[PDB]
Amino acid sequence: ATVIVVGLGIMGSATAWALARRGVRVVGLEQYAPFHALGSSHGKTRIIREAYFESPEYVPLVQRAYELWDELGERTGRRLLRVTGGVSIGRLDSPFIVGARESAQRHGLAHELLDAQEARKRFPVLALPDDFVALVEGRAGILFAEECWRAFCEDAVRHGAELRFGVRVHGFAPDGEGMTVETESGRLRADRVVVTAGPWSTTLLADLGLPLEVRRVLVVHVQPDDPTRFRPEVLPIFIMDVPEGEYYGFPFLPDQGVKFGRHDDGEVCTPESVRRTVTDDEVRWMTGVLQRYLPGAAREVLMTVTCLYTMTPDRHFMIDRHPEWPQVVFAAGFSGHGFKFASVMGEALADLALEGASRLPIGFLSFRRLAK
Numbered sequence: 001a002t003v004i005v006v007g008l009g010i011m012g013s014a015t016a017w018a019l020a021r022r023g024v025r026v027v028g029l030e031q032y033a034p035f036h037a038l039g040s041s042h043g044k045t046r047i048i049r050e051a052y053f054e055s056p057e058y059v060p061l062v063q064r065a066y067e068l069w070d071e072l073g074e075r076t077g078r079r080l081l082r083v084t085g086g087v088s089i090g091r092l093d094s095p096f097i098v099g100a101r102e103s104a105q106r107h108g109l110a111h112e113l114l115d116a117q118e119a120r121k122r123f124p125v126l127a128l129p130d131d132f133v134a135l136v137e138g139r140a141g142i143l144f145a146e147e148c149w150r151a152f153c154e155d156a157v158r159h160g161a162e163l164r165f166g167v168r169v170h171g172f173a174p175d176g177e178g179m180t181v182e183t184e185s186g187r188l189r190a191d192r193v194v195v196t197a198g199p200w201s202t203t204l205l206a207d208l209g210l211p212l213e214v215r216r217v218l219v220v221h222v223q224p225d226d227p228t229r230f231r232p233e234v235l236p237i238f239i240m241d242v243p244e245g246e247y248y249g250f251p252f253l254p255d256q257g258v259k260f261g262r263h264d265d266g267e268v269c270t271p272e273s274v275r276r277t278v279t280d281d282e283v284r285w286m287t288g289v290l291q292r293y294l295p296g297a298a299r300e301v302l303m304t305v306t307c308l309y310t311m312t313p314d315r316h317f318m319i320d321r322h323p324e325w326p327q328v329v330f331a332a333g334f335s336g337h338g339f340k341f342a343s344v345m346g347e348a349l350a351d352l353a354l355e356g357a358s359r360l361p362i363g364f365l366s367f368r369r370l371a372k
């Protein structure tokens with residue numbers, strides 16, 4: 001079998017890995033350089049969580065994603081995951097809290113709800129309002145994202161994959177014996193095509209009318225004056241639903257400081273129009289929010305970063321076959337929370353491309369729930 005994978009962000013790289021491991025001939029095509037920072041996959045760390053507030057239907061998928069991250073780590077010898085536990089902060093009726101409890105109960109997962117007093121005792125680095133609660137889980141942690149991105153490409157190449165960078169795909173069409181893919185430089189042919197185009201999905205897949213909106217979001221890295229009180233042993237990954245917005249962060253790590261980002265809002269843009277400049281007022285806002293809930297974390301700003309999310313209307317992913325051409329499958333619309341699922345999305349895409357179907361429980365992420 002031959003497959004072409006369009007886009008070598010995390011999802012395309014995972015898909016090239018899952019196909020090559022099956023003995024499938026795979027050629028990946030990516031418009032920019034390897035492990036570039038213009039899409040959604042870049043950075044040294046991402047959060048993985050198991051008691052999943054967005055919907056309990058993700059729990060069996062993230063559980064398989066954990067198993068596949070472990071297999072990837074074993075085969076490549078790269079260190080990919082650090083389980084730290086995770087804490088979610090919010091009012092008792094915040095979706096972060098409600099949804100994680102629902103997911104955990106439904107899947108039998110260990111978790112602990114703490115009131116503000118108990119949370120301050122357990123995690124004194126957090127400064128919470130008296131009416132907030134914390135929900136703690138054990139299996140959450142840090143994916144070393146760039147290590148994972150490189151791992152997939154190394155192990156795919158070990159299994160025969162070819163990966164091409166600096167090649168922009170203009171389109172594709174069935175040719176009677178598979179698909180022909182048109183690039184800015186020539187044509188390539190395969191039995192099947194997988195599209196994992198990230199924020200560029202409505203360009204390449206324009207004629208499908210996917211309901212996707214690209215958002216610019218910001219991350220800051222700060223240096224505490226007392227780093228040791230921010231280290232993983234005392235500060236798990238965290239997420240917070242607060243009056244200033246939804247935010248997330250990581251414990252202090254060497255050469256990263258404390259990383260803090262904002263999940264909600266963020267400007268609607270396209271990858272062409274996105275503002276890469278991060279303004280002084282943007283920096284001051286982020287450090288102002290971080291200092292309210294984690295006082296002493298931002299003695300110095302180390303770095304600021306822009307990145308892109310691709311949102312669906314319901315914030316659930318889209319993975320499905322092309323509605324006209326069964327030789328083509330695609331995943332898009334990861335809505336700011338897909339990186340942790342990349343290993344299992346590569347599995348699912350390889351199943352949809354080779355077999356037309358998957359035993360993974362990805363039905364709820366198809367086109368159907370979005371139909372009129």
Ligand SMILES: Cc1cc2nc3c(=O)[nH]c(=O)nc-3n(C[C@H](O)[C@H](O)[C@H](O)COP(=O)(O)OP(=O)(O)OC[C@H]3O[C@@H](n4cnc5c(N)ncnc54)[C@H](O)[C@@H]3O)c2cc1C
Binds near residue numbers: 039204332
């Ligand atoms: C700041 C930030 C923090 C995040 N935090 C988390 C987190 O903690 N945990 C989590 O699970 N998720 C997180 N995410 C979300 C996650 O990183 C994304 O969902 C995931 O990266 C999407 O991967 P992708 O491969 O779809 O997209 P992308 O990485 O953007 O890849 C698409 C690739 O397709 C290429 N391309 C597009 N069109 C063409 C074409 N015509 N021809 C050739 N190449 C093409 C692009 O150049 C790009 O390399 C975060 C995202 C951001 C921005």
Ligand SMILES: [Cl-]
Binds near residue numbers: 081082083084
């Ligand atoms: Cl670990």
Ligand SMILES: [Cl-]
Binds near residue numbers: 085137
């Ligand atoms: Cl913990």
Ligand SMILES: [Cl-]
Binds near residue numbers: 188189
């Ligand atoms: Cl050819």
Ligand SMILES: [Cl-]
Binds near residue numbers: 296
């Ligand atoms: Cl301090």
Ligand SMILES: [Cl-]
Binds near residue numbers: 302303304305
């Ligand atoms: Cl910077």
Ligand SMILES: [Cl-]
Binds near residue numbers: 040308309311335
């Ligand atoms: Cl995204």
Ligand SMILES: [Cl-]
Binds near residue numbers: 321322323324326
């Ligand atoms: Cl189809």
